Enzyme design. Structure first.
Site, short mmCIF file in Angstrom:
data_model
loop_
_atom_site.label_atom_id
_atom_site.label_comp_id
_atom_site.label_asym_id
_atom_site.label_seq_id
_atom_site.Cartn_x
_atom_site.Cartn_y
_atom_site.Cartn_z
CB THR A 1 -0.61 -0.05 1.39
OG1 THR A 1 -1.51 -0.78 1.49
CG2 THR A 1 -1.62 1.27 1.65
C1 LIG Z 1 -0.03 -2.75 0.69
C2 LIG Z 1 -1.00 -3.33 -0.37
C3 LIG Z 1 0.98 -3.37 0.96
O1 LIG Z 1 1.33 -3.59 2.16
C4 LIG Z 1 -0.89 -2.15 1.59
O2 LIG Z 1 -0.39 -2.14 2.73
C5 LIG Z 1 -2.11 -3.01 2.11
C6 LIG Z 1 -3.10 -2.24 3.26
C7 LIG Z 1 -4.36 -2.62 3.11
C8 LIG Z 1 -5.17 -2.15 4.05
C9 LIG Z 1 -6.49 -2.31 4.28
C10 LIG Z 1 -6.98 -3.26 3.26
C11 LIG Z 1 -6.43 -3.80 2.44
C12 LIG Z 1 -5.03 -3.59 2.27
N1 LIG Z 1 -1.61 -4.12 2.73
C13 LIG Z 1 -1.96 -5.28 2.53
O3 LIG Z 1 -2.60 -5.61 1.48
C14 LIG Z 1 -1.57 -6.60 3.38
C15 LIG Z 1 -0.10 -6.58 3.34
C16 LIG Z 1 0.55 -7.83 4.25
C17 LIG Z 1 0.39 -9.13 3.92
N2 LIG Z 1 0.85 -9.57 4.93
C18 LIG Z 1 1.16 -8.63 5.75
C19 LIG Z 1 0.94 -7.54 5.26
C20 LIG Z 1 1.12 -6.49 6.03
C21 LIG Z 1 1.46 -6.55 7.42
C22 LIG Z 1 1.92 -7.96 7.86
C23 LIG Z 1 1.66 -8.89 7.07
N3 LIG Z 1 -1.91 -7.99 3.12
C24 LIG Z 1 -2.88 -8.69 3.66
O4 LIG Z 1 -3.11 -8.02 4.68
C25 LIG Z 1 -2.99 -9.72 3.26
C26 LIG Z 1 -2.88 -10.80 4.31
N4 LIG Z 1 -4.51 -9.94 2.98
C27 LIG Z 1 -5.04 -10.48 1.91
O5 LIG Z 1 -4.18 -10.81 0.82
C28 LIG Z 1 -6.22 -10.53 1.47
C29 LIG Z 1 -7.12 -9.53 1.92
C30 LIG Z 1 -6.88 -8.37 2.87
C31 LIG Z 1 -8.16 -10.00 1.67
C32 LIG Z 1 -7.87 -11.03 0.91
C33 LIG Z 1 -6.63 -11.38 0.93
C34 LIG Z 1 -9.24 -11.67 0.42
C35 LIG Z 1 -10.37 -11.23 0.57
C36 LIG Z 1 -10.61 -10.03 1.26
C37 LIG Z 1 -9.48 -9.53 1.82
#
Ligand SMILES: *[C@@]([C])([C][O])[C@](*)(=O)[C]([C]C1=[C][C]=[C][C]=[C]1)[N]C(=O)[C]([C]C1=[C][N]C2=C1[C]=[C][C]=[C]2)[N]C(=O)[C]([C])[N]C(=O)C1=C([C])C2=C([C]1)[C]=[C][C]=[C]2
Ligand SMILES: [Mg+2]
Ligand SMILES: [Mg+2]
Ligand SMILES: [Mg+2]
Ligand SMILES: [Mg+2]
Lengths: 233, 211, 204, 195, 226, 196, 222, 195, 196
Positions: free
Chosen positions: B1
């Site tokens: 993000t």
């Molecule tokens: C950037 C894309 C990368 O960090 C951003 O930070 C987003 C923030 C965000 C906030 C609110 C909602 C969505 C995104 N972060 C992510 O996408 C995080 C990054 C991450 C992965 N592992 C992890 C992270 C950060 C800190 C510690 C560990 N990604 C996630 O949280 C992953 C686990 N989630 C998913 O891939 C999915 C989500 C959310 C989701 C999925 C998959 C499916 C359906 C609904 C939501």
């Protein structure tokens, strides 16, 4: 968290037209040592259910006692304990499955793989698996440990899908199970020749066979095998 | 993000991307990283999606209860502090959350950065997430207090675009918000694919990219 | 850390009717950072095309190496190398570094100049050949490409139809991969004419 | 070392490189020149592990100077960059690789064009209008993406470069003690003494 | 991978499935795991796919040169000895697990060989992730004095067990029959029980669907005259 | 694995089970662990099958070349070649070998070569994972100058117990008899030895 | 050391129509390279016109579904038999998942049904409780294989109108239930070809104002 | 956070504290005030792990303010420093210790004397004429050892403090974004707005 | 350690060596490993001496309290108390116990409780580090309904071999005879059992 000490190997089972069959050998291994040769790993619950257990034997004996106590508790203030309100295979399985999943969630599992075989009140066949992780699944054939790798392939040739169950007789099903037990004796280093077999039929009830042996074994071809490549003598 | 937020003469701008990743796999093309706590309070999300959603929705519960007890809207300062104190309860337990609490109260427009460590900072301009460095570059060189609402909205939009382009873990679309004394105003979802080609042509930027 | 996913990138190849196609993205990165949107991953030695994914230094190095070897092949044999022969050369060259390999996922594409038969092939980093009839995929979005190719692909497509199929397979796979995209190129190859098209895609 | 930047404008290449050298918790020098002239119209800046950087740069310098004398001819920037890349690609699989990242800024006298090549320690070469190594690009590329044109003058290139350094000085936790800026054009290499 | 070897009256047969994997992903649906060492000596390999090919080609090359040097047809024991000594030298780092079978002037032979250099002898063998499923079939149905037709059936049945019950195995069944006093017959895709059903829809796109920036002709021809 | 070699009046007998395991899976149930390095010098192998096969092959080569130059080698000489290989490559090997042979001069001899590469000449020797369970039985029941039939029974009973308790051992019991008369191979199936 | 988690494979797919929704999933259950069952239902009717599937570690998946079904029952008891709306179910499930933030349910959950305006709805969750409403979502083993295909064939991504050359997009016309089921079957047929954990059978649950209907289709068993 | 300095002169205590706050590779703030007024004549600066610092400082502040109200009396700097030390010494053996280092500058109205106390996260208290935490002392103590007198004026104290900051700015690899300086004397606490 | 319990016609006999080691040092060469939990219910201990002593002491307490309330406990009951302790505290214990006792109704019984806390009723049982070496000997030589003198000889010969091969075992052979007649303690010194 623990490690299994005294262990029991494969439990195998399958459905047939009027019921289910389950089998397991009588060995209690202590690592590579074939320590105990008179261990019963099929445990009947009433006259309609047989629980087959593999894995840690101390945990098996604990489960055996839970089931014995379950029968006692079900009879309390129950005039229909030997009739309409008797223990069903589905009740017994769900109880065990609840216990297994709770124990894994406390990071203190019962180190087992269990198959509950039986026949329900309405005559329906019951066959379901549960293990130390609380993972459950059902299939026309079920097997634990090595049996999953070697027995299922043979048993699935008889009952490959649900529609093959009515076409399978008890003689054919028992023959398949007995052949599978021989194959496991050939190829599982933690198995024994002596085993027990149980049939739960909706008409003839529960038949429990003890002191069975693997027979009709092929070993003669071994005489011709010499060396590991180039040796002739 | 990538997320950003900045105060200016006519309130506070809030812009975020919409990408979500599970390793190198893009799990979501369009995820809402802003939370509407109330008509005058916003919260951005960066880090663990679950942590951001759960705790900021729990903050909204607590900000709502404040209004019922006191018959008055909670301040941005107090709201940000409640959240930082929640983070401090799960100290070292592994929560990953980076958020900016944006709003308008009796002191005027307010902006507070809050993270999982419990850090709570007041300031004019913040940017969080993997692409914050790219956004800061555009913001720092083009920011003024004397910005018009139209130009300010574009700055936050353009700053996210900058990050979405360079950062592999930022993109999808841009969600815009403008906070006034009458409350916040949503200024739409903007696809980066379409926005990039549009900005390139109109602005003359991204000369190295062919289109 | 993982050499095969530091720089990112993808390559896909398809067979059609009396034709082949090979395509790649243009991205080069340092993990999260995008560095170049002009890093083409497809090369050609005569009429034989080679796409390489993985670690960019090895991609560059291997191209220079196969240019070296195909130029000598031609001087001695007095003819251009064919896809089947080149495929074996790639396999041989990769396996000679069995215990210190190039971190790459090569893809060969071309038409035999004598038989006219379309040919594609893929390799692992160590030289194992995958001689597929339908399609070959490689890169950080290989899972995505497998899904797209397997559902969109049908045999005996004409060049201008094959173009649309391979382009959509690449584009949509790249849009579900953080480490792929930033432009794309598609080669449409016939027995005596080759067209190269740059695709318009999202730049994030 | 840390920050090295590069930008290719209309008629020249500009390289900016930090002056700091740190050892332990102490900054030993704040006027270090992280660059070597490979030929009259080719300059290479470098950044990486301590000691390896200068040893590699001087080794490259010696090889190009040897070539110049042997042939009485200056190699093109492209040719020099390819030679450097091969040495790094050779190095990465050695017993102890040289951990050096470089930018090569040169003016091709044949084509009458400035050229900037970015090469990392793995041997990853890319020709770019502007480039950086390490974390430098994270802060600066957004500014360069916005402001860069290919028809920029040398003076406009320096102004855009100042803006990049100002952004670095604001948002980096690292004090890199400013930069030495050098320009490479048709007339050769010269240093901007006031920056 | 599932592979088997079965001896019979006047020869030996080997068989294999046709699936190759990259973890849980199927890379090739119709892989060829039956390799030729010499005309009448075929092997089949599990484990690291590049290693099974490379080591098979290398030994096959040296076997051909040996056959030319000695003016004799190659023996299976030679391939066996050359393979194990090569594999032993690399102490298991060459992940080649093979079933080697063939006919020569000495007779019919069937061996297994593991990556560390150990060899075994047998009338029926199985290797790979589907070895246990296949061996269950072999232990159930194998007998002494099999005919050619019975052995091919047993072999393919053993591979099928692997195809259906092992996730690492799938698609088709390849077979090679090596009979004494005959040419070896390689039966590629002897069975085809896993044909993909017709898709519900055609995903052929309208021409012009894809957005294009630039077009150009690529010069693949050499430099021209005049 | 369960292996043993026993000297008696007329010569020496080697005995072994036929089970080869990969963990708990029995990769081969009819293995031949009695391997010939010379006409009347055989060995029993335990440990890594790759290592023990490679060694026995090299030893067979050395003794074939010895024979071409100097005539029939002694059992002691064969054990020395095994030792030299096992001792000098101890860091890269896992091999426990029992060497047994017949001369007309020295008659039946048995040498055991455990992991380190040491050599021990004995009246009889036992080795393999299953040997642990029959140390007491073999010590109590072994006598010097037994008859052929007594020695066969001794090995049969001993390996029967080793197989009974050791899961890594099993299958058939193979035996090789080394005397002036020649070389006799024996085999005993489960239905015979299990009921002892 | 004891590992409390496991992987049972499987793949699921949810698509939201204009006035309907589908939730599909394969019926194969596995550990490592073995098949446990060729038919082990994974998508469930939870009542109130809501369907649900928790894909990943089956033990945690069964526990979550079981708890949500229970939550629906107690919602009726506590709130005068009021129908649990899909948005309310989604929020409830977030709190069920986050109650185990520090020992997660290792599953990717999807629910489907109709919103309060009668329109098709799909909600998708991560293991720790982040959720959001979506039009299209594949989950599980072969999710990366299927999602790009759905971006292309459901939302018409990278598709433009012939003759314009990239200037005009393909218009986002709505899909019928018959058209969606075709895309679902082709998605799973393609996934079965290239993913070893996918196969045996496909079970689809279709949700309309009339109720919940089931459809079953065979898949390759290799 | 990083650099906090303290100096006790004739009639006052001067505390200097850096303005930078870093998160990841980005400087989020360059105007952060790393201090809390515990009482009208007692100021505490702090440095340590993110989040813990402010939580600890505000907790101490609340306790001293509570005491002030209860007794209608200001605790001596010595008494406050002992209270703070005990809380840290209590903390170091807790499940999760508070990783905070502090300087307490106060003017004792009873004795008419300025007082400076240095306390680290372990609960290690020392009264000093000048003090620092972390690496700050490595660069600055040699200057203070040389130039410090106990009869210095507040203006002379500020000049010596400027020299310390200049030395830090020259030899530290760390950009701490200057310092906020506050003076504690008989009239209370005030901030030097131009430094 | 080498311990065993054997049922016979008139009751049961427990047997054990007397060696306790700390690595290779013999901390006690005259240890009494035959421990009394009730008048005619004894146990043989193996594993951690601290753990097995603490368990046997707790069991002795439970059986003393059982006796005060319900009368003389069965051997099965004693084994159940051992089991309950060994099973429920398996993560923090290293105890391998053989339980042996005499009733007039049930006569001589033997229960073995290995590491996990499982229970196994047997005609005879062996345990300890030295038991491995006599699995074959004991299986071959054990008979049901032996005489007292036959059973004493069987235990003596068995433990003699275990001591011979196991360095962790040694010293004297202690035995306890449990019959209707009463409780008889026996001891056998090295000069007696070594020459068997
Ligand atoms: C950037 C894309 C990368 O960090 C951003 O930070 C987003 C923030 C965000 C906030 C609110 C909602 C969505 C995104 N972060 C992510 O996408 C995080 C990054 C991450 C992965 N592992 C992890 C992270 C950060 C800190 C510690 C560990 N990604 C996630 O949280 C992953 C686990 N989630 C998913 O891939 C999915 C989500 C959310 C989701 C999925 C998959 C499916 C359906 C609904 C939501
Ligand atoms: Mg991006
Ligand atoms: Mg399969
Ligand atoms: Mg201190
Ligand atoms: Mg001793």
């Amino acid at each position: 968290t623990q490690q299994p000490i005294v262990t029991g190997t494969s439990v195998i089972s399958m459905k047939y037209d009027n019921g289910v069959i389950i089998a397991a050998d009588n060995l209690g291994s202590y690592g590579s040592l074939l320590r105990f040769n008179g261990v019963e790993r099929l445990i009947p619950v009433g006259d309609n259910t047989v629980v087959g257990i593999s894995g840690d034997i101390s945990d098996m004996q604990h489960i055996e006692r839970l089931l014995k106590d379950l029968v006692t508790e079900n009879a309390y203030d129950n005039p229909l304990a030997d009739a309409e309100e008797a223990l069903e295979p589905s009740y017994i399985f769900e109880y065990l499955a609840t216990v297994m999943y709770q124990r894994r969630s406390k990071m203190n599992p019962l180190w087992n793989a269990i198959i509950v075989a039986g026949v329900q009140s309405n005559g329906d066949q019951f066959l379901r698996y549960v293990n130390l992780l609380g993972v459950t699944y059902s299939s026309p054939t079920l097997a634990t440990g090595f049996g999953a790798h070697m027995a299922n392939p043979l048993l699935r040739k008889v009952v490959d899908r649900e529609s093959d169950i009515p076409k399978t007789t008890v003689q054919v099903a028992e023959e398949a199970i007995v052949n599978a037990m021989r194959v496991l004796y050939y190829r599982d280093a933690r198995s024994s020749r002596n085993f027990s077999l149980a049939i739960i039929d909706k008409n003839t009830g529960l038949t429990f066979k003890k002191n069975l042996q693997v027979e009709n074994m092929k070993w003669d071809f071994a005489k011709d095998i010499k060396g590991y490549g180039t040796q002739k003598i | 993000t990538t997320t950003l937020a900045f105060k200016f003469q006519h309130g506070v701008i809030v812009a975020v991307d919409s990408r979500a990743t599970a390793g190198s796999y893009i799990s979501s093309l369009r995820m809402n990283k802003v939370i509407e706590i109330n008509p005058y309070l916003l919260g951005t999300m960066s880090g663990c999606a679950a942590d951001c959603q759960y705790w900021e929705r729990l903050l909204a519960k607590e900000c709502r209860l404040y209004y019922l007890r006191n018959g008055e809207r909670i301040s941005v300062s107090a709201a940000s502090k409640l959240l930082s104190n929640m983070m401090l309860q799960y100290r070292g337990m592994g929560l990953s959350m980076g958020s900016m609490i944006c709003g308008w109260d009796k002191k005027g427009p307010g902006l507070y950065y809050v993270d999982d460590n419990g850090t709570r900072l007041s300031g004019q301009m913040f940017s969080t997430g993997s692409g914050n460095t790219y956004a800061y570059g555009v913001l720092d060189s083009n920011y003024k207090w004397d910005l018009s609402v139209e130009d300010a909205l574009y700055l936050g939009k353009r700053s996210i675009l900058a990050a979405a382009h360079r950062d592999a873990y930022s993109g999808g679309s841009v969600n815009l918000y403008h906070v006034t004394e009458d409350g916040w105003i949503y200024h739409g979802n903007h696809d980066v694919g379409e926005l990039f080609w549009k900005v390139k042509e109109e602005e003359g930027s991204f000369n190295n990219v062919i289109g | 850390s993982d050499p095969s996913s530091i720089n990112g990138g993808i390559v896909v190849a398809m067979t059609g009717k009396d034709c082949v196609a090979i395509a790649c993205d243009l991205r080069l990165g340092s993990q999260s950072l995008g560095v170049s949107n002009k890093f083409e991953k497809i090369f050609h030695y005569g009429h034989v095309f080679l796409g390489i994914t993985g670690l960019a230094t090895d991609v560059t190095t291997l191209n220079e190496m196969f240019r070296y070897k195909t130029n000598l092949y031609k001087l001695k044999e007095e003819r251009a190398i064919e896809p089947e022969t080149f495929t074996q050369l790639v396999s041989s060259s990769l396996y000679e570094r069995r215990f210190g390999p190039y971190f790459v996922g090569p893809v060969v594409a071309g038409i035999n100049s004598k038989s006219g038969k379309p040919f594609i092939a893929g390799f692992d980093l160590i030289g194992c050949i995958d001689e597929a009839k339908d399609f070959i995929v490689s890169g950080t979005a290989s899972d995505q490409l497998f899904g797209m190719c397997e559902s969109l692909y049908e045999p005996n497509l004409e060049p201008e139809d094959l173009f649309e199929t391979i382009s959509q397979a690449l584009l949509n796979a790249a849009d579900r991969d953080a480490l792929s995209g930033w432009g794309a190129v598609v080669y449409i190859i016939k027995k005596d004419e080759v067209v190269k098209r740059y695709l318009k895609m999202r730049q994030d | 070392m840390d920050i090295i930047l590069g930008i290719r404008v209309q008629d020249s290449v500009i390289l900016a490189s930090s002056k700091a050298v740190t050892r332990g918790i102490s900054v030993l020098k704040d006027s270090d020149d992280k660059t070597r002239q490979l030929s009259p119209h080719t300059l290479m800046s470098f950044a990486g592990e301590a000691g390896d950087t200068v040893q590699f740069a001087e080794y490259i310098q010696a090889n190009i100077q040897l070539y110049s004398i042997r042939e009485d001819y200056e190699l093109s920037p492209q040719a020099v960059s390819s030679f450097v890349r091969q040495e790094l690609a050779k190095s990465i699989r050695s017993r102890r690789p040289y951990q050096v990242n470089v930018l090569i800024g040169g003016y091709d006298k044949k084509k009458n064009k400035p050229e900037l090549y970015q090469i990392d320690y793995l041997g990853t070469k890319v020709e770019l209008p502007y480039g950086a190594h390490g974390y430098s690009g994270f802060y600066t590329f957004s500014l360069l993406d916005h402001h860069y044109r290919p028809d920029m003058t040398t003076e406009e290139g320096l102004d855009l470069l100042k803006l990049c350094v100002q952004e670095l000085e604001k948002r980096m936790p690292m004090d890199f003690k400013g930069v030495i800026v050098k320009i490479v054009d048709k007339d050769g290499i010269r240093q901007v003494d006031d920056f | 991978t599932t592979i088997v070897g079965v001896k019979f009256n006047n020869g030996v047969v080997i068989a294999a499935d046709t699936r190759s994997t990259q973890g849980p992903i199927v890379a090739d649906k119709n892989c060829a795991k039956l390799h030729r060492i010499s005309p009448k000596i075929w092997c089949a390999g599990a484990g690291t796919a590049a290693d099974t090919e490379a080591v098979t080609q290398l030994i096959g090359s040296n076997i051909e040169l040996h056959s030319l040097y000695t003016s004799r047809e190659p023996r299976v024991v030679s391939a066996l000895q050359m393979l194990k000594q090569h594999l032993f030298k690399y102490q298991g780092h060459i992940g080649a697990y093979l079933i080697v079978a063939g006919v020569d002037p000495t007779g019919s032979h069937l061996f297994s060989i593991h990556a560390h250099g150990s060899t075994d002898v047998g009338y029926y063998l199985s290797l790979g992730s589907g070895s246990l499923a296949a061996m269950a079939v072999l232990e159930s149905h194998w007998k002494q004095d099999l005919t050619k037709e019975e052995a091919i059936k047993l072999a393919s049945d053993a591979i099928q067990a692997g195809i259906w019950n092992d996730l690492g195995s799938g698609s088709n069944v390849d077979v090679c029959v090596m009979e004494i006093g005959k040419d070896a017959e390689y039966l590629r895709n002897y069975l085809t029980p896993n044909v993909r059903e017709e898709k519900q829809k055609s995903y052929k796109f309208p021409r012009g669907t894809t957005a294009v920036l630039k077009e150009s002709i690529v010069n693949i021809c050499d430099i021209q005259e005049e | 694995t369960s292996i043993m070699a026993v000297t008696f009046k007329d010569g020496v007998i080697l005995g072994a089970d036929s089970r080869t395991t990969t963990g708990a899976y029995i990769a081969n149930r009819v293995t031949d662990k009695l391997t010939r390095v010379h006409d009347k010098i055989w060995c029993c192998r335990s440990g890594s099958a790759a290592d023990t096969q490679a060694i026995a092959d090299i030893v067979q080569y050395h003794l074939e070349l010895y024979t071409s130059q100097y005539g029939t080698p002694s059992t002691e000489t064969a054990a020395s070649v095994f030792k030299e290989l096992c001792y000098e490559n101890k860091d890269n090997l896992t091999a426990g070998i029992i060497v047994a042979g017949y001369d007309d001069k020295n008659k039946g001899e048995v040498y055991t070569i455990p992991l380190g590469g040491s050599v021990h000449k004995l009246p009889y020797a036992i080795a393999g994972s299953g040997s642990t369970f029959i140390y007491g039985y073999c010590d109590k029941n072994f006598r010097e100058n037994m008859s052929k039939e007594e020695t066969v029974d001794f090995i049969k009973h001993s390996l029967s117990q080793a197989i009974k308790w050791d899961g890594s051992s099993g299958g058939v019991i193979r035996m090789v008899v080394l005397t002036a008369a020649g070389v006799e191979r024996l085999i005993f199936y489960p239905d015979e030895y299990e009921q002892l | 050391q004891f590992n409390p988690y496991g992987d049972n494979g499987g793949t699921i797919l949810g698509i939201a129509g204009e006035d309907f929704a589908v939730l599909a999933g394969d019926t194969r259950n596995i550990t490592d390279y073995s098949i446990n069952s060729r038919y082990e239902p994974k998508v469930f009717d939870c009542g109130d016109n809501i369907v649900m599937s928790a894909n990943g570690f089956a033990a945690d998946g069964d526990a979550l579904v079981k708890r949500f079904k229970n939550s629906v029952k107690w919602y009726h008891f506590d709130h005068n038999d009021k129908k649990l709306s899909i948005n309310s179910a989604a929020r409830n499930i977030q709190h069920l998942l986050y109650s185990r933030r520090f020992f997660p349910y290792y599953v990717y959950n999807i629910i489907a049904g109709l919103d309060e305006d009668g329109k098709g709805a799909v909600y998708s969750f991560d293991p720790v409780g982040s959720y959001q409403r979506e039009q299209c979502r594949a989950g599980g083993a072969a999710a990366s294989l299927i999602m790009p295909f759905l971006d292309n064939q459901v939302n018409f991504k990278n598709q433009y109108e012939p003759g314009t050359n990239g200037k005009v997009k393909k218009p986002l016309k709505y899909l019928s239930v018959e058209e969606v089921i075709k895309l679902v079957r082709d998605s799973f047929t393609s996934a079965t070809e290239r993913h070893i954990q996918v196969g045996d059978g496909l079970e689809i649950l279709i949700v309309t104002k009339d109720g919940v209907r089931k459809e079953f289709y065979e898949l390759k068993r290799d």
